[PDB]
From TrEMBL, chain A:
Full protein segment contained here: 485 to 532 of 967
Subcellular localization: Cell membrane
Classification lineage: Bacteria, Bacillati, Actinomycetota, Actinomycetes, Mycobacteriales
Source taxon at top rank: Bacteria
Protein name: MmpL5 protein
Family statement: Belongs to the resistance-nodulation-cell division (RND) (TC 2.A.6) family. MmpL subfamily.
From TrEMBL, chain B:
Source taxonomy: Bacteria, Bacillati, Actinomycetota, Actinomycetes, Mycobacteriales
Protein's recorded name: MmpS5 protein
Family the entry assigns: Belongs to the MmpS family.
Shown residues in whole-protein numbering: 2 to 69 of 138
Subcellular location: Cell membrane
Length: 48, 68
């Protein structure tokens, strides 16, 4: 039917799928946060 | 049929008994395993949707994160 167009359940339609994909955005932002932390260290050196 | 009625009836009865034996003897068992049916879908690639990522700017290089 409309919720099972090919006879199998639609992929990416379960609640646990939504739960399991909740942390991907935080993983994507990791590099930009690490750069900020390195900038914090360099700023401490500049203060010295 | 004074001397024919007996052997003919004997043969008839023996045949009936043999038939009953053959029919019922095979009914026992005959179901050792259960095999489930398989219904899969056609795994083909016709008219696949195409997604394109584009990054451009005035800078030289960039750091890119994306979800496949």
């Amino acid at each position: 039917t409309i919720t099972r167009p090919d006879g199998d359940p639609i992929e990416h339609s379960t609640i646990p799928y939504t739960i399991g994909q909740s942390g991907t955005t935080q993983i994507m932002n990791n590099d930009y946060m690490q750069t900020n932390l390195d900038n914090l260290l360099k700023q401490a050196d500049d203060l010295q | 049929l004074g001397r024919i009625w007996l052997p003919v009836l004997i043969v008839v009865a023996v045949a009936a008994g043999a038939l009953i034996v053959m029919n019922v003897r095979t009914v026992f068992g005959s179901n050792p395993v259960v095999v489930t049916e398989k219904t899969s879908d056609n795994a083909e690639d016709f008219n696949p949707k195409v997604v394109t990522y584009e990054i451009f700017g005035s800078g030289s290089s960039a750091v890119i994160n994306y979800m496949d």
